[PDB]
Each structure stands twice: as C-alpha cells, then as structure tokens.
Amino acid sequence: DRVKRPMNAFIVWSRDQRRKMALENPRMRNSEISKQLGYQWKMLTEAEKWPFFQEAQKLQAMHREKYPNYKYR
Template sequence: MTLTEMAEKPKRPLSAYMIWLNDHREQIKKENPGIKVTEIAKRGGELWRALKDKSEWDQKAAEAKDKYTKLIKEFEANGGSKEAPAGRKRNKAAKKPAVKKSKKKAESEDEEASEDESD
C-alpha cells in the first residue's frame, strides 16, 4: 500500500461485546418493537452479561485485534504517525482556555505597578 492509501490511521478494533451487539441488534429490535437506541444498548448489556459462552465473540475480537495490529504496523512503516491526526482526540489541557485573572487581582496588580512607577 502507498502512503496515500494509508493516509488515515486504522480504527481500533471492536470489543467482543460490540461485535456481539452488532450481530444481535436487529433481533433485539424485533423482540422489543419501538425500543429506543439507548434501551437497545441497555438490553444488549443485560443479554451479554447473561451469556454463558462468549468464546465465539472473544475469538472474533482477537482476530480483529490481530488484523488491526498488522494494519498499524503497515501504517507506521509507510510513514504514518503513532499520534492521533490533528484535530482528533486532543488532551484535556489543550481544550482549556487560558486562565483569566480575576478583576480584583488585575486591579491590585495595576495598583502595585503604578506604585512602583511613582517611586
């Protein structure tokens, strides 16, 4: 693959639960007509926790992770960065605006500065 084909960093693989939920979402909707999206996820979580044998889904998740690992290695070998692309997933410190001084503090600093100048 060329660098232009690999311009986007591969997406992280789905967990076993998400693979299972994607396969069972329509069935949950059929069994619960008119169910809301949030309730589908809630019901899916209940069914997933009650599921005894999750090995099929764990295996699919492991395969997806192996595929992702290979894609990431190719991506990095072709010049891709290990960091998230610009504009995506910034850390919280980058989001915070600069801290503004309180009005009182700014006034007291102004007074101190004017006193220093008059000395």
C-alpha cells in the first residue's frame, strides 16, 4: 500500500529551522511559525539551501529508484 517516504525537503527546515524559532520563541500562541515560514519561501535563505539540499538529493534518488512505477493511490 503506502511506500515509505523520508522527511520532505520542507519538513527538513522544520527540523533545524524551527529549532531556531523554539529558542527565542518556545511559546508561540497561534500557528504563526506556519505562515512565517511561507514568508521565508518567497525569500529562501541560501545559507540554509545549499547545506542540506545536497543530501536531500540522494535520499529521494535511492527510494525513488526502488519504486519507479509505484504511485500514490
């Protein structure tokens, strides 16, 4: 049925990026950290792209090559 899927390049930010928001703002009332990241997307910081994108490339490549024609259902 469902194939396994590693973290998405988007949740990757969540992992480390969010840790930054948790330091100075460990108490967010509403879901602001959500619409806030949207602002970062219209202005992606290269300091965060190049670093983890190189790895995220092969993660997808391996599992992808194991399920070529297998698609969501």
